[PDB]
From Swiss-Prot:
Effect of residue 32 to A: In a patient with Noonan syndrome
Assembly with partners or alone: Interacts (via C-terminus) with GRB2 (via SH3 domain). Forms a complex with phosphorylated MUC1 and GRB2 (via its SH3 domains). Interacts with phosphorylated LAT2. Interacts with NCK1 and NCK2. Part of a complex consisting of ABI1, EPS8 and SOS1.
Residues shown, of full length: 6 to 177 of 1333
UniProt organism field: Homo sapiens
Function: Promotes the exchange of Ras-bound GDP by GTP. Probably by promoting Ras activation, regulates phosphorylation of MAP kinase MAPK3/ERK1 in response to EGF. Catalytic component of a trimeric complex that participates in transduction of signals from Ras to Rac by promoting the Rac-specific guanine nucleotide exchange factor (GEF) activity.
Disease (UniProt): Fibromatosis, gingival, 1: A form of hereditary gingival fibromatosis, a rare condition characterized by a slow, progressive overgrowth of the gingiva. The excess gingival tissue can cover part of or the entire crown, and can result in diastemas, teeth displacement, or retention of primary or impacted teeth. GINGF1 is usually transmitted as an autosomal dominant trait, although sporadic cases are common. Noonan syndrome 4: A form of Noonan syndrome, a disease characterized by short stature, facial dysmorphic features such as hypertelorism, a downward eyeslant and low-set posteriorly rotated ears, and a high incidence of congenital heart defects and hypertrophic cardiomyopathy. Other features can include a short neck with webbing or redundancy of skin, deafness, motor delay, variable intellectual deficits, multiple skeletal defects, cryptorchidism, and bleeding diathesis.
Descriptive protein name: Son of sevenless homolog 1
Free-text tissue specificity from the UniProt record: Expressed in gingival tissues.
Length: 164
């Protein structure tokens, strides 16, 4: 039990830490669509479940992440994810998260690896939100509810096959 994001100790350190940023993301992907804490908090749970997955492989380089990502993320999302991550090291609290990473694993990490990870995490964030937004805009709703996101990720094998 090396880590549990929502315990009676760590919870305060994560709960709503990504929500503020996600609103921005959902703002760049779908300006017209309105935010909804209920959902973004769920997107957070997912994005956080992703970070944990990228940590099980105990990253120690700015490449080990690319490798892990290159080993997990289903084709096309894997390559696309890296492309972004790379183009980054070259909105999410990249700073406020860096110190946290060291605590999620218990080791040291260069500011370059964090920029890579956080970038990857945000890509899936923008990707998830991007798909959900289309769903919403398809049914003429102008709002992304938690329900929408779920039903949205379903019609997508890549993402659906990515989580469990």
């Amino acid at each position: 039990l090396p880590y549990e994001f929502f315990s009676e100790e760590n919870a305060p350190k994560w709960r709503g830490l990504l929500v503020p940023a996600l609103k921005k993301v959902q703002g760049q992907v779908h300006p017209t669509l309105e935010s909804n804490d209920d959902a973004l908090q769920y997107v957070e749970e997912l994005i956080l479940q992703l970070l944990n997955m990228l940590c099980q492989a105990q990253p120690r380089s700015a490449s080990d992440v690319e490798e892990r990502v290159q080993k997990s993320f289903p084709h096309p999302i894997d390559k696309w994810a890296i492309a972004d991550a790379q183009s980054a090291i070259e909105s999410l609290p990249v700073e406020k998260i860096h110190p946290l990473l060291k605590e999620v694993l218990g080791y040291k990490i260069d500011h370059q690896v964090s920029v890579y990870i956080v970038a990857v995490l945000e890509y899936i964030s923008a990707d998830i939100l991007k798909l959900a937004g289309n769903y919403v805009r398809n049914i003429r709703h102008y709002e992304i509810t938690k329900q929408d996101i779920k039903v949205a990720m379903c019609a997508d094998k890549v993402l659906m096959d990515m989580f469990h």
